């Protein structure tokens, strides 16, 4: 059981506001989830715990010495739908080492136990640029399975992915880890369903979920809670639901064929255009 | 003298530094009280060095490869980084071996990825699979192969583990990945528990189904002694001399397999609690196997320490061990007779690592000798539970001493002799004071067990007494 | 067992018959190990041509380098400042590393300071770090200047000094007009000899480079002079010597003589001696920068040429006969002062030398190693004794380095049989002096081994190993030697002229076998 | 003359396609300017050079031995306009370490001679997730005096922008860079302008000319060009002159006062709501 799943996916593309609206809509459907947020901002559970994390792994070591004087409960808290969640600290920008603080947060949750629960979801929140391996420690061996990128229609965003994809096949060769899909969140350039389909099927892998772009979920976010929690009836809502048991049940698992720039240039010339 | 004027040298030499700084390292400073019960109320240890005060302590690096992985003979141990590190470390540690070095022993080899720039920026782990290939390119005798993790791999997040595993499978060798990166803990402590934790995980369970080792109920293992001089192999012939069979030795002298049949052994000899307690408690916890703290540092307790494990074993291991004690009866007694004369009533301070400190305080005592201050760089707090029984009444315990406040606490005391590492041999040898090497044994050796204390006094004789330290002052100066 | 009378250290303790035994029933019993027909087979194999060409093709496994990492070198350069506290950003185990390497060397107190970066640190930055370490270290050890390098850590994670430091004056932990130069010294670029010239760099750079309006070359009428990684006591001694001797005046920046060579009396002396800031705040006055060790001092002459404004002379190391003149004469043209009668003197004493061991230097093949200056002054003068150095090797040699011995090596009759190598550890060399057996070896202690392993094929196979270069951990008092000028040259000769006749009087001291050429008079 | 810019801001906020117009519409002023590429995905320099810069300077040092061994002329290369061109390189997501080839490829460009005269402009286009120190190597001393910081109306955008100024708060204090104003990516939100200015105003600097959200743009750039190459007389290159404009003539260089976490959540309940 417990599957274990990563947000990738481009930087500011809303794999934060993705993954805690889809955790949210789990904990709905009586799925007990786990949040760790492997971002230097503290931001992948503003939602779910209601409040900017106060307790990252990071800072409660530093403000007790070392991380080996440190115990679960002082950084693990439950929010929403009693979702467990834990946040990888770092440093503020251009200071220190963000990579080697999700490195030290993964390892300390690995040592103390944090999984061994009734746990059937754990989501790793990564940030966009993952520029060394620290950021890809969530998807090492005995980590998180499943791989879900997000994307947008803007040619940015495909090239992107295609380089998470790029930085995946070594892992999924030298482990378990595979790309689940690919989840699509509105950005309504031109045509946004054709192009990642597109880039998807380039890659082998499929478009679990396309989420429109509607203000719900700023308005939501400005209150610090899910679209879920904050209008259970708006579209959006019934969106996440349904994005949420497409996850559920999803069952494709493919390495990626990361295309190269010029394959890259050619689909969006031939699919980018009216 | 006296528990005041020490608590007051103390506070004296705390005057100097800011106030932060003081009020941590005051902390680290005490006398020493047998009327304590737990030495949280009286030093506390094991914590963070306050910065640009020119600290003794080592790095995880030093503690794992220096220290615990360095020594086993048939592995190669590749210090995974840039070039420093295994320079440094390159045969500095005198871990006694017998072998034929860059064939089938690689101890006092330097075998390193020699990280360049190129290797930060884009990972390593390709070429440490490369470096693996090469190894068994070229060294096809080695029993096994250590990856020891320098500053850069802990940081940059190479797959040494991965690499490690990949690479085991295809070659049928065993590959340990250390994550002993020097900025990880404190000190070396944190580097002998990554070490004897990468021992548990890829070592110590690769016989666990099997059986075809026949074992005999005197089967002892000697943990937590690294033949510094040749202390084990001294310390060995001890053991066997009354009956028992040494299996393994750790890892000092140590082979892979023995590390692998340490689980068939029936007792555990542990001299370094600090560095391999952890293994221990595995052991004892997952096979059952006792472990018991002894100590051959001069005869008081290398008798003592004998007796007490011939008390775990039968009526023959008892009487084998009592022959041992009346045989090298008269060798140390004549070694007490020639050389307490010459060193009675000399007053010896103290700074090693973390067993040390308190584990020779009785070979001392045997001259005449008393300790009147020892700390620790790295010790926790057990270890200073353990030093209090030791040390005699009102005499200096510090850990993780600075310079300033060592070379202090040296002027102030004055001892006749100073026991501790290279970084403070010529600072001590220049203020006039006789200095001993404590880590290396001042390339002499061995000091455990009867012959080692022959040579531990001979030793302690020859540069106490030495002629040259009453000739430091000039003629033509008051 | 022990007799009281003569106790036995290790050796040879272990030799006697019940250790042996013990020994031998632990192989036996519990070690498991290849029988003694495999090892042999293996270290023959081990010792053949095919194993080079394997050992050569290496890309990726580095087996005993012959270099160290830049804060290594940083620290030493910092060293040669007066009252000044080397300080190194990052990791404290790099700190006892660089202190042990050398105490273990100079046999001497090594002062040095981390600011203890933990994991923490690693994660948020060592401001903080720095901050604390920089106020504790100049309370504690009351340096009149701080020189701060960086281990790798602080390197990898981009660990900004020029802002930390900053940082920590504008907040009062240190004062303002403390001087506290720095140079960022990446372990995984280059190597000691790197830093060495990336610290002064940066020295030289905070004394020098905001205050260039009014210097004036030549005002002082002194000659700058930089050392480079120097581990030789002697060699500073002799440029001194030399220098004033000819009444030239001259500032040796980066004089660490002093504090590597205090006495005995009583007292430690945490500093001695070295550069003083008014030296090189007047350095851009000098009439010139003459580079001791030019080819590991690059960065230096960039600087010197571009800010001070000299025009650095095209100098080798002052090693042997030639290039001590060639030294001399530049110095002469640069001062004005003529090359005194005592140096000619010492020159025509060096050369009678020659001419009296010419004999036995003659035809002597060699295989050499350090770093690049020291190596090619060494090869250049082998070839003015008439000696071959066949296997030439230095680690954290260049391209261009390279190219410059090759020509130097063209230019002789006895560099024909000679090979440079850069970027092959000891490893290499001890396959090449199986394969193509030269009749000694200079370098540092780690030549020990390949001398043992030599050993190990056999007396007529064994190479042995003259201890010049850095480190020298296995002899004593031998960092007080010289090996630039007339006098290094002479002191060079004498050691291996006497190392070739002490190994001839091993080989001919059996009695009634080779005793026949055990001549009293050589 | 030589004025050095960075340009940061959250993940995707559109830092590279706003730097590239604006590049474009300064070039198409006379002036000369040089773009600069912290990211290891280099991807600033498309919509310049109509194609993806190959050559960088990490790929051409490793490949050449080190970066002592490589020309200027081998990273450094012309495009649309005259605006020089180079990137600094970098791994594949998720290995090695891309800060490391940012400080040194920083490090090449200033011993080389990069910053010649004859240069009115030196735009650092750096990544979103400033994770280490090796990324804020634009804003270290003597290398970039302006920091333009992208943001836009979402919570996620401001906070970013927030963190961001957090964290060159220590560079600003060390030595001369300021922060010159927040350039605004319109991404269609309530009261976006509000935000954007009541935000600017509490770190105390200003909002620098609200870039509205159009398509123009994503077709101009899946053309491999920016917009001024492809539609000089469309709106949006109009709006990019206007920006280029206001970029040249200002003068609001501070040190940004960051607002806590709660100061962000009353300013985005006073301009983010209705
Ligand atoms: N479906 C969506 N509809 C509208 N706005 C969204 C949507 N998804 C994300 N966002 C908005 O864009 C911003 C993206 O920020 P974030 O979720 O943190 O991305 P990331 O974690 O990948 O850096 C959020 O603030 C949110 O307001
Ligand atoms: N004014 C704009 N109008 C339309 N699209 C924009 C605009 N600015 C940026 N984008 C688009 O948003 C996406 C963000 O990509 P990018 O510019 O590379 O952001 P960043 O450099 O911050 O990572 C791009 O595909 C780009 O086409
Ligand atoms: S392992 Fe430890 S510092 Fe227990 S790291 Fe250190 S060869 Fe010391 S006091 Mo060097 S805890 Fe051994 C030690 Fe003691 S290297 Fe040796 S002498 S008994
Ligand atoms: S605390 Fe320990 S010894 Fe230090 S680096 Fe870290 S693992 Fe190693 Fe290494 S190459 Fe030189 S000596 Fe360092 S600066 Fe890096
Ligand atoms: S790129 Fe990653 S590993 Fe390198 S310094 Fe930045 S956060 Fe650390
Ligand atoms: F804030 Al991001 F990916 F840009 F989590
Ligand atoms: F995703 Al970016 F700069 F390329 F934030
Ligand atoms: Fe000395
Ligand atoms: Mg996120
Ligand atoms: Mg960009």
Same mark, same amino acid.
């Given at each position: 059981?417990?599957?274990?799943?990563?947000?990738?996916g481009?930087?500011?593309?809303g794999?934060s506001?993705?993954?805690?609206?889809?955790?949210?809509?789990?904990?709905?459907?009586?799925?007990?989830?786990?949040?760790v947020?492997?971002?230097?901002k503290?931001?992948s559970?503003?939602?779910?715990?209601?409040?900017?994390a106060?307790?990252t792994?990071?800072?409660?070591?530093a403000?007790?010495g070392?991380?080996?004087?440190?115990?679960?409960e002082?950084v693990?808290?439950?929010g929403?739908?009693?979702?467990?969640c834990?946040?990888?600290?770092?440093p503020e920008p251009?200071?220190?080492?963000?990579?080697?603080?999700?490195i030290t947060?993964?390892?300390?949750?690995?040592?103390?136990?944090?999984?061994?629960?009734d746990?059937?979801?754990?989501?790793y929140?990564?940030?966009?640029?993952?520029?060394?391996?620290?950021?890809?420690?969530?998807?090492?061996?005995?980590?998180?399975?499943?791989?879900?990128?997000?994307?947008s229609?803007?040619?940015?965003?495909?090239?992107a992915?295609n380089?998470?994809?790029?930085?995946?096949?070594?892992?999924?060769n030298?482990?378990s880890?595979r790309?689940?899909?690919?989840?699509?969140?509105?950005?309504?350039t031109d045509?946004?369903?054709?192009?990642?389909?597109?880039?998807?099927?380039?890659?082998?892998?499929?478009?679990?979920?396309?989420?429109?772009?509607?203000?719900?979920?700023?308005?939501?976010?400005?209150?610090?809670?899910?679209?879920?929690?904050?209008?259970?009836?708006?579209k959006?809502?019934?969106?996440?639901?349904a994005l949420?048991?497409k996850?559920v049940?999803?069952?494709?698992?493919?390495?990626?064929n990361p295309?190269?720039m010029?394959?890259?240039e050619?689909?969006?010339?031939?699919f980018?255009?009216? | 003298?006296s528990?005041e004027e020490?608590?007051?040298?103390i506070?004296?030499?705390?005057?100097?530094?800011?106030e932060?700084?003081?009020?941590?390292?005051?902390?680290?400073?005490?006398?020493?009280?047998?009327?304590?019960t737990?030495?949280?109320?009286c030093?506390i240890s094991?914590?963070?060095?306050?910065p640009?005060?020119?600290?003794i302590?080592?790095?995880?690096?030093?503690?794992?490869?220096?220290?615990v992985?360095?020594?086993?003979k048939?592995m190669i141990?590749?210090?995974?980084?840039?070039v420093?590190?295994?320079?440094?470390?390159?045969?500095?540690?005198?871990?006694?071996y017998?072998?034929?070095?860059?064939?089938?022993? @690689?101890?006092?080899?330097?075998?390193? $990825?020699?990280?360049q =720039?190129?290797? #930060?920026?884009?990972? +390593? !782990?390709?070429k440490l699979?490369?470096?693996i290939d090469?190894?068994?390119?070229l @060294?096809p005798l080695?029993?096994?192969? $250590?990856?020891?993790? =320098?500053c850069? #791999?802990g940081?940059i +997040? !190479?797959?040494?583990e991965?690499?490690?595993?990949?690479?085991?499978?295809?070659?049928?060798?065993?590959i340990?990945?250390?994550?002993?990166?020097g900025?990880?803990?404190?000190?070396?402590?944190?580097?002998?528990?990554?070490?004897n934790d990468?021992?548990?995980?890829?070592?110590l369970?690769?016989?666990?189904?099997?059986?075809?080792?026949?074992?005999?109920?005197?089967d002892?293992?000697?943990?937590?002694?690294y033949?510094?001089?040749?202390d084990?192999?001294?310390?060995?012939?001890?053991?066997?001399?009354?009956?028992?069979?040494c299996?393994?030795?750790?890892?000092?002298?140590?082979?892979?397999?023995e590390?692998?049949?340490t689980?068939?052994?029936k007792l555990?000899?542990?001299?370094?609690?600090?560095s391999?307690?952890?293994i221990?408690?595995?052991?004892?916890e997952?096979?059952?196997?006792?472990?018991m703290?002894?100590?051959?540092?001069?005869?008081?307790?290398?008798?003592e320490?004998?007796?007490?494990?011939?008390?775990?074993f039968?009526?023959?291991?008892?009487?084998?061990?009592e022959?041992?004690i009346?045989?090298?009866?008269?060798?140390?007694?004549?070694?007490?007779?020639?050389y307490?004369?010459?060193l009675?009533?000399?007053r010896?301070?103290?700074?090693i690592?973390?067993?040390?400190?308190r584990?020779?305080?009785?070979?001392?005592?045997?001259?005449?000798?008393?300790?009147?201050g020892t700390?620790?760089?790295?010790?926790?707090?057990?270890?200073?539970?353990?030093?209090?029984?030791?040390?005699?009444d009102?005499?200096?315990?510090?850990?993780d001493?600075?310079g300033?406040?060592?070379?202090?606490?040296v002027?102030r005391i004055?001892?006749?002799?100073?026991?501790?590492?290279?970084?403070?041999?010529?600072?001590?040898?220049?203020?006039?004071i006789?200095?001993?090497?404590?880590?290396?044994?001042?390339?002499?050796?061995?000091?455990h067990?009867?012959?080692?204390?022959?040579?531990?006094?001979?030793?302690?004789?020859m540069?106490?007494?030495?002629?040259?330290?009453?000739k430091?002052?000039?003629?033509?100066?008051? | 067992?022990?007799?009281?009378?003569?106790?036995?250290?290790?050796?040879?303790?272990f030799?006697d018959?019940?250790?042996?035994?013990?020994?031998?029933?632990?192989?036996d019993?519990?070690?498991?190990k290849?029988?003694?027909d495999?090892?042999?087979?293996?270290?023959?194999?081990?010792?053949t041509?095919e194993?080079?060409?394997?050992?050569?093709?290496?890309?990726?496994?580095?087996?005993?380098?012959?270099?160290?990492?830049?804060?290594?070198?940083?620290?030493?350069?910092?060293?040669?400042?007066e009252?000044?506290?080397?300080?190194?950003?990052?990791?404290?185990?790099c700190?006892?590393?660089?202190?042990?390497?050398?105490?273990?060397?100079?046999?001497?107190?090594?002062?040095?300071?981390?600011?203890?970066?933990?994991?923490?640190?690693?994660?948020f930055?060592?401001?903080?770090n720095?901050?604390d370490?920089?106020?504790?270290?100049?309370?504690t050890?009351?340096?009149?200047?701080?020189?701060?390098?960086?281990?790798?850590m602080?390197?990898?994670?981009?660990?900004?000094?020029?802002?930390?430091?900053?940082n920590?004056?504008?907040?009062g932990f240190?004062?303002?007009?403390?001087?506290?130069?720095?140079?960022?010294?990446?372990?995984?670029?280059?190597?000691?000899?790197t830093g060495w010239?990336?610290?002064?760099?940066?020295?030289?750079?905070?004394?020098?480079?905001?205050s260039?309006?009014?210097?004036?070359?030549?005002?002082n009428?002194?000659?700058?002079?930089?050392?480079?990684?120097?581990?030789?006591?002697?060699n500073?001694?002799?440029?001194?010597?030399?220098?004033?001797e000819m009444g030239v005046?001259?500032?040796?920046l980066?004089?660490?003589?002093?504090?590597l060579?205090?006495?005995?009396?009583?007292?430690?002396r945490?500093?001695?001696?070295?550069?003083?800031?008014?030296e090189?705040?007047?350095?851009?006055?000098?009439?010139?920068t003459?580079?001791?060790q030019?080819?590991?001092l690059?960065?230096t002459?960039?600087?010197?040429?571009?800010?001070?404004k000299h025009?650095?002379?095209?100098?080798?190391i002052?090693?042997?006969?030639?290039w001590?003149?060639?030294?001399?004469?530049?110095?002469?043209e640069?001062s004005?002062?003529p090359?005194?009668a005592?140096?000619?003197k010492?020159r025509?004493?060096?050369?009678?030398?020659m001419?009296?061991?010419?004999?036995?230097?003659?035809?002597?093949?060699?295989?050499?190693?350090?770093?690049?200056?020291?190596?090619?002054g060494?090869?250049?003068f082998l070839?003015?004794?008439?000696?071959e150095?066949?296997?030439?090797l230095?680690?954290?040699g260049?391209?261009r380095?390279?190219?410059?011995?090759?020509?130097?090596?063209?230019?002789s009759?006895?560099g024909?049989n000679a090979?440079?190598?850069?970027?092959?550890?000891?490893?290499?060399?001890?396959?090449?002096?199986?394969?193509?057996?030269?009749?000694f070896?200079?370098?540092?202690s780690?030549?020990?081994?390949?001398?043992r392993?030599?050993?190990?094929?056999?007396?007529?196979?064994?190479?042995?190993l003259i201890?010049?270069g850095?480190?020298?951990?296995?002899?004593?008092?031998?960092?007080?030697?010289?090996?630039?000028?007339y006098e290094?040259?002479?002191?060079?000769?004498?050691?291996?002229?006497?190392?070739?006749?002490?190994?001839?009087?091993?080989?001919?001291?059996?009695?009634?076998?080779?005793?026949?050429?055990?001549?009293?008079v050589?």
């Open positions: 059981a417990m599957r274990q799943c990563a947000i990738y481009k930087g500011g593309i794999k506001t993705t993954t805690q609206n889809l955790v949210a809509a789990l904990a709905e459907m009586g799925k007990k989830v786990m949040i947020g492997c971002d230097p503290a931001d559970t503003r939602l779910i715990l209601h409040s900017k106060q307790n792994i990071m800072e409660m070591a403000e007790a070392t991380v080996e004087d440190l115990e679960l002082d693990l808290k439950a929403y739908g009693g979702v467990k834990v946040e990888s600290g770092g251009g200071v220190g080492c963000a990579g080697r603080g999700v947060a993964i390892n300390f949750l690995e040592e103390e136990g944090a999984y061994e629960d746990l059937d979801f754990v989501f929140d990564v940030l966009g640029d993952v520029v060394c391996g620290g950021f890809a420690m969530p998807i090492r061996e005995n980590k998180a399975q499943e791989i879900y990128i997000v994307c229609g803007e040619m940015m965003a495909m090239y992915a380089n998470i994809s790029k930085g995946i096949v070594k892992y999924a030298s482990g880890v790309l689940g899909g690919l989840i699509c969140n509105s950005r309504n045509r946004e369903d054709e192009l990642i389909i597109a880039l998807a099927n380039k890659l082998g892998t499929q478009m679990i979920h396309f989420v429109p772009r509607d203000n719900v979920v700023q308005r939501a976010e400005i209150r610090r809670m899910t679209v879920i929690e904050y209008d259970p009836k708006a959006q809502a019934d969106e996440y639901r949420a048991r996850v049940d999803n069952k494709l698992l493919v390495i990626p295309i190269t010029d394959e890259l050619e689909l969006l010339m031939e980018g255009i009216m | 003298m528990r020490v608590e007051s040298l506070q004296e030499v705390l005057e100097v530094y800011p932060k700084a003081r009020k941590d390292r005051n902390k680290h400073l005490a006398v020493n009280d047998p009327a304590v737990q030495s949280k109320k030093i094991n914590k963070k060095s306050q640009g005060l020119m600290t302590r080592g790095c995880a690096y030093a503690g794992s490869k220096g220290v992985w360095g020594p086993i048939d141990h590749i210090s995974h980084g840039p420093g590190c295994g320079q440094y470390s390159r045969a500095g540690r005198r871990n006694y017998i072998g034929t070095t860059g064939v089938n022993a @690689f101890v006092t080899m330097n075998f390193t $990825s020699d990280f =720039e190129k290797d #930060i920026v884009f990972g +390593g !782990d390709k699979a490369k470096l090469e190894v068994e390119t @060294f080695n029993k096994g192969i $250590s990856v020891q993790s =320098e850069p #791999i940081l +997040g !190479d797959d040494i991965s690499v490690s595993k990949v690479k085991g499978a295809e070659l049928s060798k065993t340990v990945p250390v994550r002993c990166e900025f990880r803990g404190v000190s070396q402590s944190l580097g002998h528990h990554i070490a990468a021992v548990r995980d890829w070592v369970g690769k016989r666990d189904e099997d059986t075809t080792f026949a074992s005999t109920p005197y002892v293992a000697i943990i937590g002694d033949n510094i001089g040749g084990a192999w001294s310390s060995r012939i001890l053991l066997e001399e009354m009956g028992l069979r299996v393994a030795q750790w890892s000092g002298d140590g082979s892979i397999s590390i692998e049949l689980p068939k052994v555990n000899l542990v001299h370094c609690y600090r391999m307690n952890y221990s408690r595995h052991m004892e997952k096979y059952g196997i006792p472990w703290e002894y100590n051959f540092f001069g005869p008081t307790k290398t008798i320490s004998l007796r007490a494990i011939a008390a775990k039968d009526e023959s291991i008892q009487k084998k061990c022959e041992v009346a045989k090298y009866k008269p060798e140390w007694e004549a070694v007490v007779a020639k307490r004369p010459r009675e009533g000399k010896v301070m103290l700074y690592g973390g067993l040390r400190p584990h020779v305080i009785g070979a001392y005592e045997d001259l005449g000798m008393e300790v009147v700390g620790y760089e790295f010790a926790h707090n057990d270890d200073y539970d353990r030093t209090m029984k030791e040390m005699g009102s005499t200096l315990l510090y850990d001493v600075t300033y406040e060592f070379e202090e606490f002027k004055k001892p006749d002799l100073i026991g501790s590492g290279i970084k403070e041999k010529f600072i001590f040898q220049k203020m006039g006789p200095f001993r090497e404590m880590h290396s044994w001042d390339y002499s050796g061995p000091y067990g009867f012959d080692g204390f022959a040579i531990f006094a001979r030793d302690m004789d540069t106490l007494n030495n002629p040259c330290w009453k430091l002052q000039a003629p033509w100066e008051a | 067992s022990q007799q009281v009378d003569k106790i036995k250290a290790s050796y040879p303790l030799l018959q019940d250790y042996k035994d013990m020994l031998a029933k632990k192989r019993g519990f070690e498991e290849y029988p003694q495999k090892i042999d087979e293996v270290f023959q194999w081990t010792t041509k194993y080079q060409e394997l050992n050569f093709q290496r890309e990726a496994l580095t087996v005993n380098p012959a270099k160290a990492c830049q804060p290594l070198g940083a620290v030493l350069c910092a060293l040669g400042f009252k000044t506290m080397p300080y190194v950003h990052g990791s404290q185990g700190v006892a590393y660089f202190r042990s390497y050398f105490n273990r060397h100079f046999r001497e107190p090594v002062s040095c300071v981390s600011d203890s970066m933990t994991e923490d640190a690693a994660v930055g060592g401001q903080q720095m901050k370490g920089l106020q504790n270290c100049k309370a050890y009351k340096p009149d200047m701080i020189a701060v390098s960086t281990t790798c602080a390197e990898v994670i981009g660990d900004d000094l020029n802002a930390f430091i900053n920590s004056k504008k907040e240190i004062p303002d007009e403390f001087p506290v130069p720095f140079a960022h010294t990446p372990s995984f670029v280059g190597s000691h000899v010239d990336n610290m002064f760099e940066g020295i030289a750079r905070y004394f020098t480079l905001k260039m309006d009014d210097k004036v070359v030549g005002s009428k002194k000659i700058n002079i930089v050392p480079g990684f120097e581990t030789y006591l002697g500073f001694r002799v440029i001194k010597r030399m220098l004033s005046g001259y500032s040796l980066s004089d660490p003589e002093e504090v060579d205090t006495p005995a009396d009583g007292q430690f945490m500093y001695a001696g070295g550069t003083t800031q008014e090189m705040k007047d350095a851009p006055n000098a009439l010139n003459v580079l001791l030019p080819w590991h690059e960065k002459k960039k600087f010197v040429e571009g800010t001070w025009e650095v002379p095209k100098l080798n002052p090693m042997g006969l030639d001590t003149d060639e030294f001399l004469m530049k110095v002469s640069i004005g002062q090359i005194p005592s140096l000619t010492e025509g004493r060096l050369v009678d030398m001419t009296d061991s010419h004999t036995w230097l003659h035809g002597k093949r060699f295989a050499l190693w350090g770093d690049p200056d020291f190596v090619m060494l090869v250049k070839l003015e004794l008439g000696c150095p066949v296997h030439i230095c680690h954290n260049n391209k380095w390279k190219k410059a011995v090759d020509a130097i090596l063209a230019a009759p006895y024909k090979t440079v190598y850069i970027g092959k550890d000891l490893w290499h060399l001890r396959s090449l002096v199986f394969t193509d057996k030269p009749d070896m200079i370098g540092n780690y030549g020990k081994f390949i001398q392993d030599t050993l190990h094929k056999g007396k007529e196979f064994e190479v042995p201890r010049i850095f480190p020298i951990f296995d002899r004593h008092h031998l960092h007080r030697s010289t090996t630039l000028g290094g040259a002479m002191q060079i000769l004498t050691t291996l002229v006497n190392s070739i006749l002490e190994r001839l009087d091993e080989e001919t001291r059996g009695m009634q076998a080779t005793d026949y050429n055990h001549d009293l050589r």
